[PDB]
PDB file of C-alpha atoms and ligand atoms in Angstrom:
ATOM      1  CA  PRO A   1      13.565  -1.850 -84.157  1.00 29.24           C
ATOM      2  CA  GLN A   2      11.103   1.034 -85.184  1.00 27.79           C
ATOM      3  CA  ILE A   3      13.321   4.128 -85.717  1.00 26.55           C
ATOM      4  CA  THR A   4      11.511   7.326 -85.241  1.00 30.71           C
ATOM      5  CA  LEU A   5      12.444  10.298 -87.632  1.00 30.68           C
ATOM      6  CA  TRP A   6      12.092  13.072 -85.064  1.00 33.87           C
ATOM      7  CA  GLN A   7      15.908  13.071 -84.755  1.00 32.61           C
ATOM      8  CA  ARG A   8      18.390  12.049 -87.311  1.00 29.34           C
ATOM      9  CA  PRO A   9      18.519   8.163 -87.512  1.00 28.38           C
ATOM     10  CA  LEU A  10      22.075   7.671 -86.576  1.00 27.63           C
ATOM     11  CA  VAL A  11      23.408   4.057 -85.582  1.00 27.18           C
ATOM     12  CA  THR A  12      26.659   2.254 -84.777  1.00 26.59           C
ATOM     13  CA  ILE A  13      28.153   0.224 -87.497  1.00 30.40           C
ATOM     14  CA  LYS A  14      30.958  -2.239 -87.187  1.00 29.28           C
ATOM     15  CA  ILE A  15      33.458  -2.151 -90.086  1.00 26.84           C
ATOM     16  CA  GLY A  16      37.013  -2.995 -90.722  1.00 25.63           C
ATOM     17  CA  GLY A  17      37.359  -3.653 -87.092  1.00 25.14           C
ATOM     18  CA  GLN A  18      36.278  -0.335 -86.334  1.00 21.70           C
ATOM     19  CA  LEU A  19      33.059   1.148 -84.820  1.00 20.71           C
ATOM     20  CA  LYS A  20      31.500   4.433 -86.457  1.00 19.43           C
ATOM     21  CA  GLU A  21      28.427   6.406 -86.407  1.00 21.72           C
ATOM     22  CA  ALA A  22      26.417   6.693 -89.607  1.00 18.35           C
ATOM     23  CA  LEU A  23      23.045   7.942 -90.877  1.00 18.92           C
ATOM     24  CA  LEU A  24      20.130   5.435 -92.040  1.00 17.92           C
ATOM     25  CA  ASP A  25      19.870   7.247 -95.497  1.00 17.35           C
ATOM     26  CA  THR A  26      17.065   5.984 -97.695  1.00 18.64           C
ATOM     27  CA  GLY A  27      18.133   8.845-100.135  1.00 20.10           C
ATOM     28  CA  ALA A  28      21.512   7.230-100.479  1.00 22.77           C
ATOM     29  CA  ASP A  29      21.996   4.691-103.289  1.00 22.71           C
ATOM     30  CA  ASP A  30      25.338   3.820-101.776  1.00 22.46           C
ATOM     31  CA  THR A  31      26.941   3.498 -98.435  1.00 20.14           C
ATOM     32  CA  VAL A  32      29.595   6.371 -97.986  1.00 19.83           C
ATOM     33  CA  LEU A  33      31.925   6.721 -95.181  1.00 17.97           C
ATOM     34  CA  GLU A  34      34.534   8.936 -94.086  1.00 20.13           C
ATOM     35  CA  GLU A  35      38.393   8.111 -94.984  1.00 20.84           C
ATOM     36  CA  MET A  36      39.330   4.888 -93.552  1.00 22.64           C
ATOM     37  CA  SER A  37      41.327   1.811 -94.510  1.00 25.82           C
ATOM     38  CA  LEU A  38      39.674  -1.360 -96.100  1.00 22.97           C
ATOM     39  CA  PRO A  39      41.164  -4.449 -97.320  1.00 24.43           C
ATOM     40  CA  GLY A  40      41.079  -5.735-100.803  1.00 26.28           C
ATOM     41  CA  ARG A  41      40.596  -4.369-104.255  1.00 26.10           C
ATOM     42  CA  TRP A  42      38.980  -1.021-105.060  1.00 22.44           C
ATOM     43  CA  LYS A  43      38.520   1.340-107.969  1.00 24.46           C
ATOM     44  CA  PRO A  44      37.726   5.145-108.231  1.00 22.14           C
ATOM     45  CA  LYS A  45      34.120   6.527-108.409  1.00 22.27           C
ATOM     46  CA  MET A  46      32.500   9.875-108.427  1.00 20.30           C
ATOM     47  CA  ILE A  47      29.132  10.284-106.528  1.00 20.84           C
ATOM     48  CA  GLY A  48      26.979  13.076-106.546  1.00 25.83           C
ATOM     49  CA  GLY A  49      24.759  14.742-104.149  1.00 24.61           C
ATOM     50  CA  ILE A  50      23.663  18.187-103.071  1.00 24.42           C
ATOM     51  CA  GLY A  51      26.515  20.581-103.840  1.00 26.41           C
ATOM     52  CA  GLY A  52      28.027  18.378-106.554  1.00 26.40           C
ATOM     53  CA  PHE A  53      30.311  15.305-106.712  1.00 24.51           C
ATOM     54  CA  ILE A  54      33.288  13.935-104.593  1.00 26.30           C
ATOM     55  CA  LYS A  55      35.622  11.286-105.582  1.00 25.32           C
ATOM     56  CA  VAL A  56      35.653   8.029-103.714  1.00 23.97           C
ATOM     57  CA  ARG A  57      37.141   4.726-103.521  1.00 24.67           C
ATOM     58  CA  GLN A  58      34.766   1.831-104.211  1.00 25.09           C
ATOM     59  CA  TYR A  59      35.285  -1.503-102.180  1.00 25.06           C
ATOM     60  CA  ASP A  60      33.171  -4.409-102.955  1.00 25.90           C
ATOM     61  CA  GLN A  61      31.924  -7.184-100.567  1.00 26.73           C
ATOM     62  CA  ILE A  62      32.844  -5.629 -97.370  1.00 26.72           C
ATOM     63  CA  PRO A  63      31.274  -7.326 -94.349  1.00 26.65           C
ATOM     64  CA  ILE A  64      29.647  -4.876 -91.893  1.00 23.67           C
ATOM     65  CA  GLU A  65      27.099  -5.285 -88.858  1.00 23.72           C
ATOM     66  CA  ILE A  66      24.422  -2.836 -88.097  1.00 25.50           C
ATOM     67  CA  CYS A  67      22.355  -3.156 -85.039  1.00 26.85           C
ATOM     68  CA  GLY A  68      23.316  -6.870 -84.636  1.00 26.39           C
ATOM     69  CA  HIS A  69      22.565  -7.391 -88.232  1.00 25.00           C
ATOM     70  CA  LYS A  70      25.398  -8.777 -90.319  1.00 21.74           C
ATOM     71  CA  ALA A  71      25.403  -7.828 -94.094  1.00 21.84           C
ATOM     72  CA  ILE A  72      27.940  -7.415 -97.037  1.00 22.78           C
ATOM     73  CA  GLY A  73      28.108  -4.818 -99.619  1.00 20.25           C
ATOM     74  CA  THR A  74      29.775  -2.164-101.297  1.00 19.31           C
ATOM     75  CA  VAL A  75      31.380   0.685 -99.332  1.00 21.78           C
ATOM     76  CA  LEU A  76      32.284   3.891-100.910  1.00 22.39           C
ATOM     77  CA  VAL A  77      35.311   5.781 -98.903  1.00 21.23           C
ATOM     78  CA  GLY A  78      36.141   9.551 -99.209  1.00 21.87           C
ATOM     79  CA  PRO A  79      35.454  12.861 -98.114  1.00 21.83           C
ATOM     80  CA  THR A  80      31.878  12.912 -97.138  1.00 20.38           C
ATOM     81  CA  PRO A  81      31.179  15.442 -94.472  1.00 19.88           C
ATOM     82  CA  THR A  82      28.776  12.568 -92.750  1.00 20.57           C
ATOM     83  CA  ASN A  83      28.887   8.699 -92.789  1.00 20.30           C
ATOM     84  CA  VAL A  84      25.786   7.282 -94.480  1.00 17.12           C
ATOM     85  CA  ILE A  85      24.318   3.856 -94.799  1.00 16.18           C
ATOM     86  CA  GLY A  86      22.543   3.797 -98.294  1.00 20.24           C
ATOM     87  CA  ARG A  87      19.921   1.722 -99.742  1.00 18.69           C
ATOM     88  CA  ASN A  88      22.477  -1.405-100.788  1.00 18.53           C
ATOM     89  CA  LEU A  89      23.032  -2.205 -97.143  1.00 18.70           C
ATOM     90  CA  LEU A  90      19.673  -1.326 -95.799  1.00 21.83           C
ATOM     91  CA  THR A  91      17.955  -4.053 -97.994  1.00 21.09           C
ATOM     92  CA  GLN A  92      20.225  -6.447 -96.386  1.00 20.92           C
ATOM     93  CA  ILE A  93      19.014  -5.717 -92.996  1.00 20.13           C
ATOM     94  CA  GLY A  94      15.367  -5.741 -94.219  1.00 21.37           C
ATOM     95  CA  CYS A  95      15.066  -2.002 -93.596  1.00 20.94           C
ATOM     96  CA  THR A  96      11.501  -0.534 -94.799  1.00 18.23           C
ATOM     97  CA  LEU A  97       9.942   2.793 -94.716  1.00 15.82           C
ATOM     98  CA  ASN A  98       6.349   2.615 -93.125  1.00 17.80           C
ATOM     99  CA  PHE A  99       3.435   5.034 -92.810  1.00 18.62           C
TER     100      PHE A  99
ATOM    101  CA  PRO B   1       2.315   1.548 -97.059  1.00 14.28           C
ATOM    102  CA  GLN B   2       5.652  -0.484 -96.418  1.00 12.61           C
ATOM    103  CA  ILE B   3       8.264   0.616 -99.043  1.00  8.60           C
ATOM    104  CA  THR B   4      11.313  -1.466 -99.500  1.00  7.06           C
ATOM    105  CA  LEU B   5      14.482  -0.081-100.640  1.00  8.62           C
ATOM    106  CA  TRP B   6      15.742  -2.399-103.480  1.00  9.76           C
ATOM    107  CA  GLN B   7      14.720   0.721-105.718  1.00 10.76           C
ATOM    108  CA  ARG B   8      14.925   4.384-104.710  1.00  8.07           C
ATOM    109  CA  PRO B   9      11.850   5.476-102.606  1.00  9.38           C
ATOM    110  CA  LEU B  10      10.321   7.682-105.123  1.00  8.61           C
ATOM    111  CA  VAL B  11       6.839   9.123-104.617  1.00  5.30           C
ATOM    112  CA  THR B  12       4.495  11.245-106.064  1.00  2.10           C
ATOM    113  CA  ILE B  13       3.952  14.515-104.347  1.00  2.00           C
ATOM    114  CA  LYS B  14       1.617  17.225-105.112  1.00  2.00           C
ATOM    115  CA  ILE B  15       2.269  20.953-104.413  1.00  2.00           C
ATOM    116  CA  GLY B  16       0.552  24.143-105.699  1.00  2.00           C
ATOM    117  CA  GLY B  17      -1.843  21.916-107.449  1.00  2.00           C
ATOM    118  CA  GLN B  18       0.859  20.260-109.599  1.00  2.00           C
ATOM    119  CA  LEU B  19       2.177  16.677-109.361  1.00  2.00           C
ATOM    120  CA  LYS B  20       5.882  15.938-108.957  1.00  2.00           C
ATOM    121  CA  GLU B  21       8.385  12.811-107.975  1.00  2.00           C
ATOM    122  CA  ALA B  22      10.550  12.990-104.908  1.00  2.00           C
ATOM    123  CA  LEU B  23      12.597  10.836-102.939  1.00  2.00           C
ATOM    124  CA  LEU B  24      11.726   9.961 -99.428  1.00  2.00           C
ATOM    125  CA  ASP B  25      15.039  10.907 -97.658  1.00  2.00           C
ATOM    126  CA  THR B  26      15.672   9.958 -94.068  1.00  2.00           C
ATOM    127  CA  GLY B  27      19.204  11.310 -94.334  1.00  2.00           C
ATOM    128  CA  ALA B  28      17.700  14.868 -95.343  1.00  2.00           C
ATOM    129  CA  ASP B  29      16.591  17.118 -92.442  1.00  2.00           C
ATOM    130  CA  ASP B  30      14.753  19.283 -94.550  1.00  2.00           C
ATOM    131  CA  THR B  31      12.586  19.005 -97.889  1.00  2.00           C
ATOM    132  CA  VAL B  32      14.221  20.430-101.039  1.00  2.00           C
ATOM    133  CA  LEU B  33      12.598  21.032-104.441  1.00  2.00           C
ATOM    134  CA  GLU B  34      14.072  21.645-107.889  1.00  2.00           C
ATOM    135  CA  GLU B  35      13.191  25.119-109.100  1.00  2.00           C
ATOM    136  CA  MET B  36       9.552  26.020-108.963  1.00  2.46           C
ATOM    137  CA  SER B  37       7.207  29.012-107.797  1.00  5.05           C
ATOM    138  CA  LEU B  38       5.741  29.352-104.505  1.00  3.73           C
ATOM    139  CA  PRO B  39       3.675  31.909-102.655  1.00  2.00           C
ATOM    140  CA  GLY B  40       4.650  34.471-100.081  1.00  5.90           C
ATOM    141  CA  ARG B  41       8.020  35.762 -99.035  1.00  5.90           C
ATOM    142  CA  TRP B  42      11.151  33.525 -98.671  1.00  6.88           C
ATOM    143  CA  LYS B  43      14.024  33.722 -96.362  1.00  6.89           C
ATOM    144  CA  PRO B  44      17.672  32.378 -97.193  1.00  3.67           C
ATOM    145  CA  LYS B  45      18.905  29.153 -96.097  1.00  5.49           C
ATOM    146  CA  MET B  46      22.277  27.250 -96.778  1.00  3.92           C
ATOM    147  CA  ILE B  47      22.162  23.581 -96.945  1.00  5.23           C
ATOM    148  CA  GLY B  48      25.045  21.163 -96.984  1.00  5.09           C
ATOM    149  CA  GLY B  49      25.508  17.734 -98.822  1.00  4.06           C
ATOM    150  CA  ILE B  50      27.835  15.362-100.175  1.00  4.06           C
ATOM    151  CA  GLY B  51      29.391  18.037-102.430  1.00  2.00           C
ATOM    152  CA  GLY B  52      29.313  21.049-100.250  1.00  2.00           C
ATOM    153  CA  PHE B  53      26.722  23.518 -99.999  1.00  2.00           C
ATOM    154  CA  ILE B  54      24.092  25.048-102.018  1.00  2.91           C
ATOM    155  CA  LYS B  55      21.949  28.369-101.539  1.00  2.47           C
ATOM    156  CA  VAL B  56      18.112  27.600-101.426  1.00  2.56           C
ATOM    157  CA  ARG B  57      15.052  29.716-100.885  1.00  2.00           C
ATOM    158  CA  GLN B  58      12.878  28.629 -97.455  1.00  2.00           C
ATOM    159  CA  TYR B  59       9.261  28.900 -97.976  1.00  2.00           C
ATOM    160  CA  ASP B  60       7.249  28.312 -94.586  1.00  2.00           C
ATOM    161  CA  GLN B  61       3.581  26.821 -94.168  1.00  4.05           C
ATOM    162  CA  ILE B  62       3.341  25.339 -97.723  1.00  4.03           C
ATOM    163  CA  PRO B  63       0.772  22.719 -98.279  1.00  4.70           C
ATOM    164  CA  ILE B  64       2.124  19.616 -99.990  1.00  7.77           C
ATOM    165  CA  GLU B  65       0.498  15.971-100.396  1.00  8.58           C
ATOM    166  CA  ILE B  66       3.079  13.203-100.183  1.00  6.69           C
ATOM    167  CA  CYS B  67       1.753   9.722-101.420  1.00  6.36           C
ATOM    168  CA  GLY B  68      -1.783  11.212-100.789  1.00  6.13           C
ATOM    169  CA  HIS B  69      -1.018  12.194 -97.176  1.00  6.56           C
ATOM    170  CA  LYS B  70      -1.502  15.807 -96.345  1.00  8.42           C
ATOM    171  CA  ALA B  71       1.482  17.908 -94.732  1.00 10.44           C
ATOM    172  CA  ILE B  72       1.942  21.622 -94.187  1.00  9.45           C
ATOM    173  CA  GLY B  73       5.516  22.642 -93.668  1.00  7.99           C
ATOM    174  CA  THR B  74       8.770  24.122 -94.596  1.00  9.27           C
ATOM    175  CA  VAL B  75       9.889  23.517 -98.269  1.00  8.61           C
ATOM    176  CA  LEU B  76      13.361  24.652 -99.729  1.00  4.98           C
ATOM    177  CA  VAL B  77      13.720  25.556-103.320  1.00  8.99           C
ATOM    178  CA  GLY B  78      16.994  25.558-105.270  1.00 11.21           C
ATOM    179  CA  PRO B  79      19.417  23.850-107.615  1.00 10.13           C
ATOM    180  CA  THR B  80      19.101  19.961-105.979  1.00  6.13           C
ATOM    181  CA  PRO B  81      19.958  17.309-108.261  1.00  3.71           C
ATOM    182  CA  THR B  82      16.595  15.653-107.147  1.00  3.33           C
ATOM    183  CA  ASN B  83      13.709  16.318-105.305  1.00  2.00           C
ATOM    184  CA  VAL B  84      13.843  15.320-101.776  1.00  2.00           C
ATOM    185  CA  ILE B  85      11.324  15.059 -99.049  1.00  2.00           C
ATOM    186  CA  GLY B  86      13.305  15.217 -95.668  1.00  2.32           C
ATOM    187  CA  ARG B  87      12.244  14.484 -91.978  1.00  7.19           C
ATOM    188  CA  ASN B  88      10.468  17.771 -91.475  1.00  5.35           C
ATOM    189  CA  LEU B  89       7.658  16.292 -93.736  1.00  7.81           C
ATOM    190  CA  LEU B  90       8.198  12.550 -93.276  1.00  7.67           C
ATOM    191  CA  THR B  91       7.377  13.035 -89.486  1.00  6.16           C
ATOM    192  CA  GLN B  92       4.199  14.771 -90.432  1.00  7.93           C
ATOM    193  CA  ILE B  93       3.015  11.727 -92.315  1.00  9.75           C
ATOM    194  CA  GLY B  94       3.981   9.261 -89.755  1.00  9.85           C
ATOM    195  CA  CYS B  95       6.825   7.654 -91.578  1.00  8.83           C
ATOM    196  CA  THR B  96       9.459   5.572 -89.513  1.00  9.84           C
ATOM    197  CA  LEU B  97      12.139   2.997 -90.517  1.00  8.68           C
ATOM    198  CA  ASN B  98      11.566  -0.478 -89.478  1.00  8.74           C
ATOM    199  CA  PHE B  99      13.767  -3.724 -89.607  1.00  7.89           C
TER     200      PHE B  99
HETATM  201  C1  C7U C 101      20.038  21.026 -93.065  1.00  7.14           C
HETATM  202  N1  C7U C 101      19.076  20.683 -94.010  1.00  7.14           N
HETATM  203  C2  C7U C 101      19.148  20.167 -94.789  1.00  7.14           C
HETATM  204  N2  C7U C 101      18.230  19.431 -95.523  1.00  7.14           N
HETATM  205  C3  C7U C 101      18.711  18.341 -96.558  1.00  7.14           C
HETATM  206  C4  C7U C 101      18.125  17.968 -97.638  1.00  7.14           C
HETATM  207  C5  C7U C 101      19.034  17.070 -98.472  1.00  7.14           C
HETATM  208  C6  C7U C 101      20.352  17.100 -98.013  1.00  7.14           C
HETATM  209  S1  C7U C 101      21.408  15.962 -98.902  1.00  7.14           S
HETATM  210  O1  C7U C 101      22.638  16.912 -99.265  1.00  7.14           O
HETATM  211  O2  C7U C 101      20.905  15.817-100.298  1.00  7.14           O
HETATM  212  N3  C7U C 101      21.700  14.872 -98.108  1.00  7.14           N
HETATM  213  C7  C7U C 101      22.179  14.850 -96.989  1.00  7.14           C
HETATM  214  C8  C7U C 101      23.091  13.633 -96.708  1.00  7.14           C
HETATM  215  C9  C7U C 101      23.964  13.304 -97.817  1.00  7.14           C
HETATM  216  C10 C7U C 101      24.001  13.820 -95.231  1.00  7.14           C
HETATM  217  C11 C7U C 101      20.468  13.966 -98.215  1.00  7.14           C
HETATM  218  C12 C7U C 101      20.716  12.556 -98.959  1.00  7.14           C
HETATM  219  O3  C7U C 101      20.140  11.583 -98.956  1.00  7.14           O
HETATM  220  C13 C7U C 101      21.237  12.738-100.500  1.00  7.14           C
HETATM  221  C14 C7U C 101      19.939  13.099-101.164  1.00  7.14           C
HETATM  222  C15 C7U C 101      20.492  13.170-102.715  1.00  7.14           C
HETATM  223  C16 C7U C 101      19.889  12.433-103.565  1.00  7.14           C
HETATM  224  C17 C7U C 101      20.173  12.369-104.874  1.00  7.14           C
HETATM  225  C18 C7U C 101      21.203  13.425-105.229  1.00  7.14           C
HETATM  226  C19 C7U C 101      21.460  14.392-104.234  1.00  7.14           C
HETATM  227  C20 C7U C 101      21.146  14.205-102.925  1.00  7.14           C
HETATM  228  N4  C7U C 101      21.949  11.473-100.950  1.00  7.14           N
HETATM  229  C21 C7U C 101      23.141  11.356-101.474  1.00  7.14           C
HETATM  230  O4  C7U C 101      23.875  12.341-101.549  1.00  7.14           O
HETATM  231  O5  C7U C 101      23.324  10.201-102.066  1.00  7.14           O
HETATM  232  C22 C7U C 101      24.723   9.928-102.497  1.00  7.14           C
HETATM  233  C23 C7U C 101      25.193   8.783-102.187  1.00  7.14           C
HETATM  234  O6  C7U C 101      24.531   7.738-102.782  1.00  7.14           O
HETATM  235  C24 C7U C 101      23.897   8.183-104.047  1.00  7.14           C
HETATM  236  O7  C7U C 101      22.378   8.291-104.079  1.00  7.14           O
HETATM  237  C25 C7U C 101      22.184   9.600-104.465  1.00  7.14           C
HETATM  238  C26 C7U C 101      23.419  10.515-104.716  1.00  7.14           C
HETATM  239 CL1  C7U C 101      23.604  10.573-106.377  1.00  7.14          CL
HETATM  240  C27 C7U C 101      24.471   9.698-103.914  1.00  7.14           C
HETATM  241  C28 C7U C 101      20.945  17.893 -97.194  1.00  7.14           C
HETATM  242  C29 C7U C 101      19.966  18.663 -96.248  1.00  7.14           C
HETATM  243  O8  C7U C 101      20.223  19.453 -95.300  1.00  7.14           O
HETATM  244 CL1   CL C 102      26.494  -3.648-102.670  1.00  6.44          CL
HETATM  245 CL1   CL C 103      12.710  -7.637 -98.547  1.00  2.09          CL
HETATM  246 CL1   CL C 104       8.411  21.871 -91.527  1.00  2.00          CL
END
C-alpha cells in the first residue's frame, strides 16, 4: 500500500497472539511496545528519545504480522507512551519512504 | 527518491542558509531541531516522546529545504537528541510510506 502522512500512520499488528495498534515510525531504530507478555529469553536495555531514556525488556526473534506481512525481529517492551514499529521490522516488510 | 530503512533515513536540510543533518521521521507529528537561532517571535510548546516531554520554541512559516525539496512551515527548537523532520514538513515534500 501507499500510506499517506496527513495523519499518523497507524496500523494493526499481530504479536504474541494479541492485536495491537502501532505507529509506522521511520525515526525509531527499534520496535517498542507497551507492557505485554512475550515468550522466551530477554535482556534489559535503555532506549533514548525526546525526553530521555526508558528501561525496556529486549526480546529477540519474535514473530509479528503487519498488514498481512509476516516478519521476525526484536521487540522492546516497556513504558512507552505509544507503540511504535521501528526500522528493524519496517525493512522486513519492504517499507520505504518515497518523494 | 526511494529511501530504504536498513540505516537511519538521514538527509541534509538547509535552514537559515546552513546545512544540517536530520532524520526523516514518520513517527513525529512535528519537526524538532537542536538549539539554533531563528528569526521572529516564538510561542511555547511542550512535545512528548519516549522519555517524557520537553519544552521547545515554536517558530512559524520558516523556509527549510529537505533533500533539496522546498518547504515553509513550523519548526520547533529545543533539546532534542537528534534533528527530526516530522509529518508537518514530510507532507510538504510529498513523502509517503510504501510497501
Ligand atoms: C506533538 N508534536 C510532536 N512532534 C514530535 C517530534 C518528535 C517526537 S519524538 O518523541 O522524538 N518521537 C515520537 C514517537 C516516539 C511517538 C519521534 C520518534 O521517531 C523518535 C525520534 C527520535 C530519534 C532519536 C532520538 C530521539 C527521538 N524515535 C525514538 O524515540 O526512537 C527510539 C526507539 O528506537 C530508537 O531510535 C531512536 C531513539 Cl534513540 C530510540 C515527538 C513529537 O511530538
Ligand atoms: Cl531485529
Ligand atoms: Cl530492500
Ligand atoms: Cl507546518
